[model samples]
Target: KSDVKLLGAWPSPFVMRPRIALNIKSVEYEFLEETLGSKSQLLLESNPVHKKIPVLIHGGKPICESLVIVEYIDEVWSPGPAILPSDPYDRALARFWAAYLDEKWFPTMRNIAAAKDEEARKALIDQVGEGLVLLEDAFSKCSKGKGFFGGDQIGYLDIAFGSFLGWLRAIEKMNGVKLMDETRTPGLLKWANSFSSHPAVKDVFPETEKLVEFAKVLAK
Candidate 1:
């Protein structure tokens, strides 16, 4: 039996986090794809409360939640080279900004659709712009001398936020607004461009065409 196994499927942002972490960390594990319409017994057993995918099982034990599973992967294989930084303050900062994406970014994307007035819509877009400005600042702080959030190499915040770049673009397409551009937020633009250039990340990066389909579905 394999010591490490992932219970999830492709094109899912939550599942993508841990999967990419393992691959980048050079940790070998079994990739178990779930159809998700029907709940698998293994999944039910592993994460009964959430009953969700993106569960990482090691030594027959399961770790649930995408963020937690990713933290586990980083710790389990913590050599000199680690995804989470060894510095205590650095790790805390990474998690803080990572949570900013979950709390601030996605919420804006999901709620902006409900804006009912021109004034409301303007406020919503303005909120999004403010959020992106902060994120751009965060990117600049990390990429002062490098391409990613953590110096030259990708790190925790990069993994946390980079995965959502595709879906964010999809919202812009449907809403028909350029969220990040060279004129405003150049740092995030460059980071997104660099992150997308990766063969592995690019392969799984959400496509504008498909995301449009998903966005339409969400509208209903």
Candidate 2:
């Protein structure tokens, strides 16, 4: 058996995080696609607590959660082409922004999608706009003339947040909301473009066509 294995579902932004990290690190691993509806025996056995995807199995051990798996991959692999910042404070800052992206931004965005009324939808979209502004401000504080979150290299925060850009764009279209416009959030838009084009990101990401198709099904 391969030392490293990933349990994930296709088109999951969460799953894409560790996938991008492993690809960037050039780590060899087996890809085990899971059915979100029907849980696998290995997945149930490994992550008995959460039973979630983006689980990294290394040497018969499973690590749950996407960000945690990325950290594990970074620690096991070489630090050069590093994902996390070398400075402790900077790394903490990166982790903070990443958490904001997941907690503040993602929840609001999901709310916009599942909103029943126009008023509720607009309120959620406004919340998303506010979160985007905060994210842009945080980016300005950390990114030092670099394309990604952790300076020039595609580090932990980059892999963590970059994986969500495609889905965010699709969600925008699905909800008829545009919170990530260049005019409103220029820095974030630029970062999204840069991160989307990053080598590792470009390689492992699901194609736009496939994503659009998935969104179409999701809308049903």
Cα RMSD, each candidate: 2.2, 1.7
lDDT per residue (tens digit) for residues 126-218 in model 1: 888888888888888766769888777877788888878877788788889998878778888888888877654676677877978876764
> Per-prediction TM-score, please?
0.89, 0.93
lDDT of 2 by residue, 164-202 (tens): 788777777766678788877888888887888878888
Error of 1 at 12 (Å): 2.1
Whole-structure CA lDDT of model 1 = 0.81
What are the lDDT figures for the candidates, one per model?
0.81, 0.82
Give the best candidate by TM-score. 2
